[PDB]
């Protein structure tokens, strides 16, 4: 279940994560997801892995040919992030993946400075927030 | 050749090398450091082509190999055909 | 001209065994992912 | 002598990032798998050939706000 | 020895049998009795 939280971050917490339909970045995301499930990686580590992953030479300067302030469109991100949870066997009932990933985003849409996060509380760290105030959490 | 009908009542157990050893509770020396502290003189595998009149390597290897083959009954039933 | 002999270098710890590599590290041994062409 | 309450559990504000950074896990896992005695997890099987970006450095190590650290963010 | 216990292509094979074969001669595999319920298990559960 924390998986959905992670995926929410990869979808909404990252400006310009390249074109997320392309098999390259898509495979990055797939692998990292399967590594957040089965506990092989920390969420923080997998996130910093995702944003630091290799995309394409002169990335920013190709980004000047698409984006103004470097914020891409979020559809590709959510469609890929649902796709990965479906193709990996993550849930017993297929729909649940997409529903949760969608729902958790919709609830956060109403929050002040919604897509930014304090770096310490964003993921697993020594000191944490109470389960009500955790970010994409079911208890908010 | 050179056959008699012989009765051999007791053969010792298998030389698999792994048998649960005799257990104790107390030990004589209670000082486990001696295990890690012990050194010895060097074992040099070879000197000058390793020639010997008693042929040690060959002879000892074969003698071990013989009773090993005896006990596994020549490893002849164990392998099927893959 | 190198009077330390590689023949005698080491310390006997008594019973303590340690591993050594004949040539390379065992992880580097089977290269099959480039050989049989499994790579992204 | 009065101090802010949680100073006991206060994080190291310079170095608390190091532990989690992708390169560290690449190196560590790299010499762990090299042993032959560890089954590589699959993420390693992947980023083995797509190692992460070089010059992305934190703001904690480089004290520059104006440095644009990430090609992504 | 782990491949036969789980009928692999069972739903396909069932479909082929039901559509193209007379009911007098057809063998139908049931997924419920098969190891995982004839499915692929959820991710982290099955020990791999
Ligand atoms: Mg005072
Ligand atoms: Mg106090």
DSSP-H helix ranges across A52-74: 59-63
DSSP-H helix ranges across A37-74: 43-51, 59-63
Report d(CA D38, CA C27) in Å as an integer.
9
DSSP-H helix ranges across chain E: 10-20
Evaluate whether A15 touches D18 at the Cβ level (below 8 Å).
no
Phi-psi region of B59 (alpha: psi -120 to 50; beta: other; left: phi over 0): alpha
- D72 vs A69, A70, B41, D60, CA distance in Å? 12, 8, 63, 18
Evaluate whether A85 touches A3 at the Cβ level (below 8 Å).
yes
| Unique residue bearing structure tokens 């049989």 | C36
Instruction: Give the resolution value in Å.
Output: 3.3
| Unique residue bearing structure tokens 């896992």 | D29
Q: Which residues of C5-28 are buried (b: 16+ CB within 10 A; e: fewer)?
A: eeeeeeeeeeeeeeeeeeeeeebe
Tell me C16's DSSP state: -
Evaluate whether A136 touches A2 at the Cβ level (below 8 Å).
no
- B7 vs A79, B2, B4, B10, D20, CA distance in Å? 82, 15, 9, 9, 73
Give just the sign of the alpha carbon dihedral E34, E36, E40, E46.
negative
- D64 vs B36, C32, D58, CA distance in Å? 53, 45, 9
- E12 vs A120, B20, B60, E25, CA distance in Å? 50, 54, 63, 17
Nearest to A120 by CA among A44, A17, A12, A24: A44
Q: Which residue of chain E is at minimal alpha-carbon distance from A88?
A: E43
Nearest to A47 by CA among A105, A124, A106: A124
Number of Cβ within 10 Å of residue A4's Cβ equals 24
DSSP-H helix ranges across chain B: 33-37, 56-71
How many helices (H) and strands (E) in chain E?
1, 0
Report d(CA A23, CA A84) in Å as an integer.
12
Question: Minimal Cα–Cα distance from B14 to chain C, Å?
Answer: 26
Nearest to A55 by CA among A23, A83, A32, A33: A23
Helix H or strand E segment including A98: helix A95-108
B39–C15 CB contact, under 8 Å: no
D8 Cα to the center of ligand 2, angstroms: 9
**Coil, strand or helix: which one is A127?**
coil
Question: What is the distance, to the nearest Å, from the Cα of residue A89 to the centroid of all Cα atoms in its chain?
Answer: 18
Evaluate whether A55 touches A49 at the Cβ level (below 8 Å).
no
Question: What is the distance, to the nearest Å, from the Cα of residue E47 to the centroid of all Cα atoms in its chain?
Answer: 21
Evaluate whether D49 touches D4 at the Cβ level (below 8 Å).
no
C14–B35 CB contact, under 8 Å: yes
List, as ranges, residues 1-40 from C with C-beta within 8 Å of D.
25-29, 39-40
Measured between beta carbons, the chain C residues lying within 8 angstroms of D28 are none
Helix H or strand E segment including D47: helix D42-47
């Amino acid at each position: 279940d924390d998986m959905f939280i992670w995926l929410c971050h990869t979808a909404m917490s990252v400006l310009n994560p390249g074109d997320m339909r392309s098999r390259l970045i898509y495979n990055h995301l797939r692998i990292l997801a399967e590594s957040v499930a089965s506990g092989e990686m920390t969420q923080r580590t997998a996130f910093r892995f995702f944003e630091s992953a290799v995309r394409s030479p002169a990335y920013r300067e190709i980004a000047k040919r698409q984006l103004e302030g470097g914020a891409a469109t979020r559809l590709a991100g959510i469609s890929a992030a649902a796709d990965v949870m479906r193709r990996m066997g993550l849930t017993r009932r297929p729909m649940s993946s997409y529903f949760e990933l969608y729902q958790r985003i919709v609830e956060r849409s109403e929050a002040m400075t919604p897509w930014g996060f304090p770096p310490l509380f964003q993921f697993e760290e020594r000191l944490s927030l109470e389960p009500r105030l955790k970010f994409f959490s079911r208890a908010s | 050749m050179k056959y008699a009908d012989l009765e051999l009542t007791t053969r010792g157990e298998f030389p698999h090398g792994m048998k649960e050893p005799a257990f104790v509770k107390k030990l004589d020396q209670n000082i486990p450091w001696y295990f890690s502290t012990y050194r010895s003189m060097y074992h040099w595998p070879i000197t000058g082509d390793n020639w010997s009149d008693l042929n040690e390597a060959e002879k000892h290897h074969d003698l071990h190999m013989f009773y090993t083959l005896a006990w596994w009954k020549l490893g002849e039933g164990i392998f099927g055909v893959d | 001209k190198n009077l330390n002999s590689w023949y005698t270098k080491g310390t006997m710890r008594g019973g303590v065994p340690r591993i050594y590599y004949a040539w390379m590290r065992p992880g580097s041994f089977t290269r099959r992912r480039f050989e049989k062409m499994r790579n992204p | 002598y009065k101090m802010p309450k949680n100073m006991g559990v206060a994080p190291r504000f310079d170095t608390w990032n190091e532990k989690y950074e992708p390169w560290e896990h690449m190196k560590r896992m790299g010499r762990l798998v090299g042993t032959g005695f560890y089954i590589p997890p699959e993420w390693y099987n992947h980023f083995r050939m797509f190692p992460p970006i070089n010059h992305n450095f934190q703001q904690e190590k480089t004290l520059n706000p104006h440095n644009a650290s990430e090609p992504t963010q | 020895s782990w491949w036969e216990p789980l009928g692999y292509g069972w739903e396909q094979h069932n479909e082929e049998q039901k559509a193209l074969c007379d009911v007098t001669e057809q063998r139908l595999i049931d997924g419920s009795n098969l190891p995982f319920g004839g499915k692929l298990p959820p991710f982290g559960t099955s020990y791999g």
